[PDB]
């Protein structure tokens, strides 16, 4: 058994290289990860656990994303690797981050415990209701956050549930609803809705829909199709289904060229097998904006766009009824 803690700069391929794992084995792991793409997002501090057999060959890899979540890659008799995801539901605690404006909101928010990303999420959500340049105080704020713990250990997982500002120029408050978007007290959403399709009408034919229980034709084992396939010719324009920011731009051996956009604290969308990517990391995009050209890169039986919608990092049927 090998315990490896991810450090700045590491990639799954780099870790395998330093731990002596063969290229062929790296490819089997990348192959099964096509349908999950968990290993591409490894961050410093997370841990990889490698289980070697009597022959000193990798028999199982455990990717500890957090103390309550792990992806398990197991070697099968046929040489391939199978995937299993395990999640433990610890306990969630509520924490209130309150402060007064004497520094600017950002400074005061950071001083009271909120992170940069939390401050960004807050300013993003409240941008139309608050001018963080003119509405300046004496004014205070209260942020309700839910933090997940495991026993006495903070998992690092958290989510802002409510945002309220006590302003002299008028109080403002927003709450995270069941649909993953923030609404004001009157029920007006502070975040824009999404388009259902990532392509033009001409290519909306679905050749293969979302199906987490899909069984492999050869082995009979469950190999989930975590996205929707659209019948696009190589070169067809691909558009973002929502406002957001490009957070991932990679060239994967199996998923081919792919992109991931973060729309808000809850939603993300993935676009795989692209022939060409027209945006870069950090770039903000609008709903309906062209972000790439469909392709046939990676591993596939034919050209097509594989589209995914993730809710709190869990894939869901992009064509499902309830979803903003
Ligand atoms: Na290698
Ligand atoms: Zn697909």
Curated annotation (Swiss-Prot):
Cofactor: Zn(2+)
Family: Belongs to the peptidase M23B family.
Gene name in the database record: shyB
Protein name per the record: Peptidoglycan DD-endopeptidase ShyB
Protein keywords: Cell wall biogenesis/degradation, Hydrolase, Metal-binding, Metalloprotease, Periplasm, Protease, Signal, Zinc
Portion of the parent chain present: 66 to 390 of 426
EC number of this enzyme: 3.4.24.-
Spans traversing the lipid bilayer: none
Record organism: Vibrio cholerae serotype O1 (strain ATCC 39315 / El Tor Inaba N16961)
Broad EC category: hydrolase
């Amino acid at each position: 058994r090998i315990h490896y803690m991810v450090k700045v700069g590491d990639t799954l391929s780099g870790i395998f290289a330093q731990l002596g794992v063969p290229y062929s084995i790296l490819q089997k792991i990348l192959s099964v990860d096509l349908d999950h793409l968990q290993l591409d997002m490894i961050q410093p501090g997370e841990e990889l656990e490698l289980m070697m057999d009597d022959m000193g060959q990798l028999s199982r890899l455990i990717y500890h994303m957090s103390i309550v979540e792990k992806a398990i890659y197991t070697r099968e008799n046929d040489g391939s690797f199978s995937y299993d995801f395990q999640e433990i539901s610890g306990e969630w605690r509520e924490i209130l981050f309150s402060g007064e404006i004497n520094g600017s909101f950002s400074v005061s928010a950071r001083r009271v415990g909120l992170t940069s990303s939390q401050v960004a999420n807050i300013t993003q959500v409240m941008k139309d209701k608050i001018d963080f340049s003119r509405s300046l105080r004496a004014d205070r704020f209260d942020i309700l956050v839910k933090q997940q713990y495991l026993g006495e250990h903070n998992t690092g997982n958290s989510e802002i549930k409510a945002i309220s500002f006590k302003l002299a120029k008028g109080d403002v408050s927003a709450f995270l609803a069941e649909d993953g978007r923030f609404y004001d007290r009157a029920g007006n959403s502070l975040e824009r809705a999404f388009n259902r399709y990532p392509v033009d009408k001409a290519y909306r034919q679905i050749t293969s829909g979302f199906n987490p229980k899909r069984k492999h034709p050869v082995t009979g084992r469950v190999v989930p199709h975590n996205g929707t396939d659209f019948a696009t010719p190589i070169g067809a324009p691909v558009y973002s289904t929502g406002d957001g920011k490009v957070i991932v731009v990679r060239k994967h051996p199996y998923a081919g060229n792919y992109l991931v956009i973060e729309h808000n604290s809850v939603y993300k969308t993935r676009y795989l097998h692209l022939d060409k990517i027209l945006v870069k990391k950090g770039q903000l995009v609008k709903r309906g904006q062209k972000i790439a050209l469909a392709g046939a890169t990676g591993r596939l039986t034919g050209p097509h766009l594989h589209f995914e919608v993730l809710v709190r990092n869990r894939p869901v049927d992009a064509m499902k009824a309830d979803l903003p």
